[PDB]
Amino acid sequence: HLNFLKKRLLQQCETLKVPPKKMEDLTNVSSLLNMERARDKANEEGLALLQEE
Amino acid sequence: KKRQRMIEVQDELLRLEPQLKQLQTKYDELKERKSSLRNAAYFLSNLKQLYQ
């Protein structure tokens, strides 16, 4: 029964339609955020330094 | 935009930096000239009085 459920869900998700919006791999995105956050922090730091100057 | 701001502020600083020096030396030399010429006028008048 669970195999039939899985195959019907696979068919439904394959048939499902979405507007053309890019959506990156589920596992990695979180890591990217962390890096992005750090980037902003660094940028902010540099910005502060620039303003300080 | 902050990097451009860097560009204009550094340009203004490097332009204004030399401007102080010539004005300072001109002020100093003119003040020295004034003091020297006032002294010299005093001495020439005093020596003329001595001669008379």
Side-chain angles (χ1 to χ4, degrees), chain A residues 1-36 38-53, chain B:
Chain A
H1 184 237
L2 277 175
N3 282 358
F4 183 80
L5 170 145
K6 162 158 197 38
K7 73 175 292 297
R8 170 197 56 254
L9 265 293
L10 284 176
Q11 297 324 101
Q12 285 184 351
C13 75
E14 266 188 35
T15 300
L16 206 54
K17 184 258 179 164
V18 64
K21 190 168 182 183
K22 185 53 186 183
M23 182 305 278
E24 206 267 330
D25 196 291
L26 297 192
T27 55
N28 206 3
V29 285
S30 85
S31 80
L32 267 169
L33 270 297
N34 304 334
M35 294 182 286
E36 288 160 351
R39 296 290 262 269
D40 273 348
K41 182 50 66 178
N43 299 132
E44 294 152 353
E45 164 71 30
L47 200 63
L49 300 173
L50 297 187
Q51 291 150 339
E52 203 275 338
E53 291 283 344
Chain B
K1 85 163 158 55
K2 285 294 184 178
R3 165 185 317 170
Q4 285 97 25
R5 196 72 189 99
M6 295 298 102
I7 301 299
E8 291 85 4
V9 299
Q10 181 63 64
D11 186 74
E12 201 47 56
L13 178 62
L14 61 83
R15 289 199 318 104
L16 296 195
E17 163 81 4
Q19 200 167 326
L20 274 70
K21 272 73 179 173
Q22 83 272 12
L23 308 176
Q24 183 81 16
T25 182
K26 188 147 60 176
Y27 150 73
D28 291 331
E29 68 192 0
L30 272 295
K31 179 163 190 170
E32 182 65 26
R33 188 191 216 279
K34 172 187 81 68
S35 45
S36 64
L37 64 86
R38 190 266 297 165
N39 300 336
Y42 169 70
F43 314 127
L44 62 91
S45 44
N46 189 179
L47 273 296
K48 187 169 184 177
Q49 270 308 316
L50 266 292
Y51 170 59
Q52 196 58 254

